[PDB]
Structure formats: structure tokens, C-alpha cells
């Protein structure tokens, strides 16, 4: 599963570069703090997972 | 020397640490947007 | 009308970025140690 791996973290890559941009605005912007506050748990579920995905995945390198 | 499968990544991690300087450096970007 | 703030961040990169080229050219330039 060498292949499908690269994308498992290259997933937690674009997720967090996005989480970095999102989360903030959600506590500062008036543009509804609750819809954004909920989509917040979105990546924070993939985050916990996506890494754990690279998790047991990491052992299957070369 | 980044464990094989991650070689594709040294390109980034190579600029990873140099973040921290940016952070005090950031708390400044904002403050001007707020005119102090 | 450009945000007086952004006038200061875009530029504060001009030096921050040019001095960065400068600092590189000291590791391969004509003034390198090689």
C-alpha cells in the first residue's frame, strides 16, 4: 500500500494548512460563529484520524 | 535522510522550524491592521 | 485607499526577502569560500 499512503498524509497536509486558516476566523468573524464553529469539528475529526491513518500506515514504508 | 517514503517531503520540512520567528513576527502584522 | 497596513506588510517583505537573496549569495556567490 506504498501508494495510497502518500495521499493519506498528503491529506493531513492540505487539511491543516486549511485548519490554520479556518479555526481562527471562526472565533473572530461575525459571519455566523456557529455554522463555522461546527464545520470546525469537521477537519478535527479527519485531523485525529488522518494522522492516525498515516498512523498504522507509516509502518508500511519501502 | 528522511525515512524513504517521506523523501518527497524533506522539501517542506526543510523549511519547517523557521516558523517560530514568524510567530512574534506575526503578532505585528495584526497590530497595524488595528493601528495600535 | 489601499490598507495603510498592507502597504507596510507587502514592503516589510521587500527587505525581508531581498536581504534573504543577499544572505544566500554569501553561500555560493563570487564572495563564497569556494
Amino acid at each position: 500500500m506504498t501508494i495510497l499512503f502518500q495521499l493519506a498524509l498528503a491529506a493531513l497536509v492540505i487539511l491543516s494548512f486549511v485548519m490554520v486558516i479556518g479555526v481562527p476566523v471562526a472565533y473572530a468573524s461575525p459571519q455566523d460563529w456557529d455554522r463555522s464553529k461546527q464545520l470546525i469539528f469537521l477537519g478535527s475529526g479527519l485531523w485525529i484520524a488522518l494522522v492516525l491513518v498515516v498512523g498504522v500506515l507509516n509502518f508500511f514504508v519501502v | 535522510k528522511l525515512p524513504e517514503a517521506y523523501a518527497i517531503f524533506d522539501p517542506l520540512v526543510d523549511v519547517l522550524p523557521v516558523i517560530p520567528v514568524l510567530f512574534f513576527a506575526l503578532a505585528f502584522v495584526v497590530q497595524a491592521a488595528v493601528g495600535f | 485607499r489601499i490598507p495603510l497596513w498592507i502597504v507596510a506588510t507587502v514592503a516589510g517583505m521587500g527587505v525581508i526577502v531581498i536581504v534573504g537573496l543577499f544572505f544566500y549569495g554569501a553561500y555560493a556567490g563570487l564572495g563564497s569560500s569556494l
Binding site: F17, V20, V25, A28 | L12, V15, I19, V34 | -
Partner: peptide
């Protein structure tokens, strides 16, 4: 060849998180 792209991206990221936050207006 040059990740000089990555650093500038990461850069422009947070100094423009404020832009959007100032153009959307949001008690900064």
C-alpha cells in the same frame, strides 16, 4: 527544485488570514 514556494505560501497564509478577517470584519 525550490520549495521557495512553500515558505512564501505558509508566509502569505497568516498575514492574509487577517486580510480576510478585516475584509469580512471580525473584531480583531
Amino acid at each position: 527544485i525550490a520549495q521557495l514556494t512553500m515558505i512564501a505560501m505558509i508566509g502569505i497564509a497568516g498575514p492574509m488570514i487577517i486580510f480576510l478577517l478585516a475584509v469580512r470584519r471580525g473584531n480583531l
